[PDB]
């Protein structure tokens, strides 16, 4: 997700892959399947 | 002589890149029905797919495994096609969003799927009664065109659900039922005329295709009418200036990725070539830079934000 | 001696998985109670009150309508007369409930209205249905 | 048939966060201390029981600016506002008390109990 | 050091491809006087020529025979130039055929052939009386410019037969007879001043060039007048949308064939390179696909058919 | 026994080589007798009746004129006043006879009218003549 | 000088076939049985002596639709119509009689004699 | 008129050459130099 | 593995060529403030620089000396950038010179240098009080943003000297003095809080950044106002036709020189390749031909000469 | 015997190095004496007479103004009101003297007027000054 | 500070030569014998003392055409006119006398003395 | 300033370099630092 190694030491530029990751989120993540907010009555 | 059955993936993928390139030359009507936020989601998801594809292209062409190389070539192709489609759709929305621009309605029908379906029965008329294609072959000669007649009724049905004139909507439903009931009369021709077919009922089997062909000709003639003709939008000078950064980055992405696949073709034939790996490394950076500038331009140029 | 009482160090992020579903459910409760409904969508003399922010979050058309400055602060939005009222009704209920009710009869107006509202994901779902029945 | 779009709820919240990040149809400014915070009233009422009581009040439904109590921590409220649009609650070794206190001020009891669980460990 | 005198064909052919590419960028006035059906005939005939050229490029560069390789390179170049000229002409006719488009008249004169003919006598004035080009040389100094003065009268004659104003037509015929009779006075200067030329009559030989140069300057000044200036047509948005499929396929044909000749250059230097033959195979398909889409687009988009 | 009488099998195509010449000759006979002449071409107060289909088959200009919808069903077509009547007359006779009569005097009006009617093959022939005399 | 463009006659017929294939200025519809056939009157009169007699008739010169006799074979007439525009007469082991019969109905005696020569061998 | 063989088994795509042939005509061809149609009197 | 630290010059130079290419796609407002004669001088001087660069590219890549190769690659890049900038500027002047064209005013401010300067303080707010970037580091955290605040006052000062409305000019000077005096209050925070910084005065050091950040936010919000928004010029059809010969020759120069650097990359990795040297020779001619046609077009198309 | 008196053979070119400076100085003397001043430049009710050819040789704007046909033979040229009179005065004196007087106060109006007159070399010099003080 | 643009004087003369080569604002035609020469009056007065005396004359300041004496060599005047715009004086083994004579006719004494120096060697 | 020699006899086309030279000037050059023209009094 930044650079991958090709033969003879050259690289493949994957900076766009990391640029999308910085947009999706942006250290430990904690899940919580419980209800997050109050429920509104009908 | 080798790698011949792996080059076809590279040859066909580049053709698909040439085809989607046609979308960026002049957007005047939308490519699809994507929301602008849906274009951001499509571009970001295809970038995740294109990244895995490029790594597969290099690691495969490094040490054989040509079947996986063809999969990565086809995967990178379809990912770049999703890039172009979402970029052209977003570029159009940015253009028409200018207060001094116009709107361009899309055609109510697509006179291309009906043209191929017309040839599915036109070239099948003489292919069932001439010294070239004889009897027996009814499993293929009927099914390959029945899928198009059913798709004809499906395309003609949704075409009525979009027009405002009930005169056309009534005619679309009528023309769709004409192709359907004419095929329904052909169902009886398939029910019989199986083994007892020495001109025992073939005169009536063709008699069911006559209303099947003339109703398709009647539907195709109605598809090229006013209102149904698409209208291009009038993008203002400021709207053209705002959409070009998305278009230019999309054009550069395709031209840089095409040279990458072209270089990957030569390295798939023979990987022991440091200069060729250097050219691939150079194209990989211009591809990544074009994607970053494309995503950044689409994010900044939302039709709501200033 | 002494001792210090700290909840560790560093950073932590708690991911409320069902938070997005609770927000959409609460937004749907506001619509059912007509709470802060800032627009009414007229579809062939049939009115539909909803929230502009929810319409823009789901429909690419309503996003284009309310991002337009001279149409941003509009109380009423009249759609094209060729839009089926119940076809738009199924889509509007889908925006607040994530439920798309499709039958062999209404799928015509649903997909036609889906592409009018610029909802490509709904259009592809309706096309999958038709290509399977 | 009733098709269930499982990813629809997360896409609406993400798009609502895109509108806030671009100040699109933000109809209220939540002022805490000297910091400005623009958001959507519908999202604030859906998540905070306090803001629900504010904008349901007929005399306060059409308010453009809402000034919170000065004792409310601005950075603590920012983490809560970001949680409403991103479903992500970021807790540090310091701001955890400011987030817990601001959560109960906004009448977000489930976020309060989550901070009660995290402060135990 | 070898293949140096075979590369010039590749270098010059690509330049010719760069030049015809300029026709496709923005057609606003016709390239020539071809009928639309004549464009179909020209494209189909040049495709027959280009096919034989590509086979000659591969089979020559396979095993030496560089002279035949240079012939196939030049043949493929001129065939692609005929492709572009007929495609740009057809694309223009499709554009102006729209009922909401305009017409663009071509200039009555071409101020480029008269500019080169002006330099044929301008640089020849001092080249017949300065310490650089002395006497004797009258066989070349007179014939290389007499062909341009005769072509000047020919171009000026047909230019009068197209203008509506008899004021210009009278002036064109007058200006054409001025360059002719001034050269006719120079015929006497060539009749004499052969061996007896030690300033025996050279003062009168230049005295015949003075009305020959000032009349050419008078004709060139009249070529840059109103009406004679070309006017570009106003292609409607629908006319631009209809002509682009012909333009895009023509642009793709040139860019794909240019890379083919470029790859053929490397294979002509050294054919033992399987990766290079693979790149040529990839370009050969994109070339063929571009031609097929070009011919199909020109056939469907006749200014008469819907 | 019996025997069958069939003209062989397969397919066959008979190529009438001089058919194209006979059609053009018959079309010219129709013009000389004013049979189904559907248009009259006026060139500086000088009329010329011919067939629209033949004019479009030879001239790229007349093709553009009659493919124009608002000019398709026109009885009279007035050319530009700068068109020589006899220059157009030589071209019209060439369309029906395949004969191009060129002299050192009329070649000016022939080539000028040829490029006006968009007849590139005639223009190149006149240019070959001038580049040879 | 009189220049002879040898390829001109074939180019006019080919362009006339392009106009028919695109329905450009087709001024008559020849209806045989239930099949439609649009063509140009000038080409029909030049090749068929029958159509020449029809459109030379002053009361039938401006007819848009021409209905042939029902006994005329549609496929046989199609081969003749295609021959008028392409100079190509396609004969099979079956349709040869329908082409020969329709040719003499259209008063195309030279095409009839060609079919008489081919039926001999 | 479809594909020609290059070294190492690769091809040159000449499908456009065959595509033009299908347009020009489209099995035995027979020539006839005789008059095809009736001649119209002057 | 070698030549890795010499490829970066080729990779970065091509990116710069992709960026200047964006200037030629649609000139509607001037690139800079060059006189038309200044464009001739810039093009002729950059041609003198590009010539020495190409000779350096070949002679270096011939026999190692990769540092000098990277210098010639970067030199050829910047020379081609000056070509494009002067060509796009000249092409714009030729377009607006038509009597049926319009003028396009440039924006009074550039909302890009203020956006980067905003992130210089936005990302520096939390970078001075969170578990990530602690104290001590005040030599870097203050100087890297003080250069942007001083450049903010410089850019805001000259922006006032161009606007006609004294309401904006008064506000620009006011907003420039707000960022200056807020930093002047931060000078006292740098004067102290050196070693005695255990929250001894850091509460007041951040209290000086609060008016420093909110005044920058106030200045950035005023940069996106009417009048300040740039307006594109309306180039007439004749103006578009006259400027294209300069644009086409400039586009061909970049695309031909990009392939030259791309070929020079492969030859820098391994020079022993006669086919690759032939491709470089082919690109060198198309580059030279494009420059000659560019200079000739700019000379003939002066806004004064006919 | 005899002898010939010739100044050699071939060609020769004499380069007057300070000729360009003498022309510009003489042109400035003509302006100071109002000799053949063919235009007056008004900058906020402040007039400036000069030579059109010198203005076009230095300013890209004045080149565009007088190459315009409908503005070529203009006696008076009124600049935009946002142009500082003394800022234009420093530039005009620079055109005839090659001297650019820059201080920390007037450099604002000089560079702003320099880019208005399209004098890129002066703009880059002012930008160098500001990036150094 | 006073910045000295050393290359400014040569750029103005070069641009003035560009205007003459394109006939831009050329306000006088100097006719010698039968040859036309268009130039700018300001450049002619700056270099030639004769033309300075002509256009300073109030009755001759607005003259469009200036006809020199017939004895003036046209090619000699052309070398002088080119020198005024290019600072380059081209002298051959023949035209050197025509340039020297035309220079003193135009009252360009420094160009005369330069020709006096060159004719010595 | 016209062509430079690359390995294997190929060339680099520098005709644009010579084309600029022909524009800047266009055999012995002679310098003269003396005053060229008359000086105009104030």
Residue numbers in the entry:
A (entry chain D), H (entry chain D), L (entry chain D): 1 to 26, 36 to 51
B (entry chain C), E (entry chain C), I (entry chain C): 1354 to 1659
C (entry chain B), F (entry chain B), J (entry chain B): -4 to 128
D (entry chain A), G (entry chain A), K (entry chain A): 7 to 127
What did the original publication write about this model?
The cytoplasmic adapter protein talin controls the ability of cells to adhere to the ECM. KANK proteins (isoforms 1–4) are known to bind to talin, but unlike talin, which is ubiquitous throughout the FAs, they localize to a belt region in the periphery of FAs. KANK proteins share a common overall domain structure, each with an N-terminal KN motif responsible for a direct interaction with the talin rod domain R7.
To overcome this common bottleneck in protein crystallography we generated a new version of affinity capture crystallography (ACC), a method which uses the homodimeric BTB domain of BCL6 as a non-covalent crystallization chaperone. We synthesized a fusion peptide of the mouse KANK1 KN motif (mouse residues 30–60) linked to the NcoR1 BBD sequence by a short triglycine linker (KN1BBD). In the structure, only one of the two lateral grooves of the BTB is occupied due to an unexpected interface between BCL6 and R8 that occludes access to the upper lateral groove sterically restricting corepressor access on a single side. By contrast, the KN motif is comprised of a β-hairpin linking to an α-helix. In this arrangement, the anti-parallel β-hairpin is sustained by intramolecular hydrogen bonds between the backbone residues, V33, Q34, T35, P36, F38 and Q39. Whereas most amphipathic helices tend to have only helical propensity in isolation, L41 connects to and stabilizes the C-terminal α-helix by creating a hydrophobic cap with L43, which maintains a talin binding epitope with both charged and hydrophobic faces. The interaction involves two main regions: firstly the carbonyl backbone of the KN motif β-strand participates in hydrogen bonding with the side chains of S1637, R1638, K1645, T1649 and R1652 on R7, and secondly, the KN motif signature ‘LD’ region, 41LDLDF45, where the side chains of L41, L43, F45 and V49 occupy complementary hydrophobic cavities that pattern the R7 surface. Overall, the novelty of the KN motif, and the unique interface it makes with talin R7 explain the reason for its stringent specificity and high affinity, in contrast to simpler α-helical LD motifs such as RIAM and paxillin whose talin rod interactions are multiple.
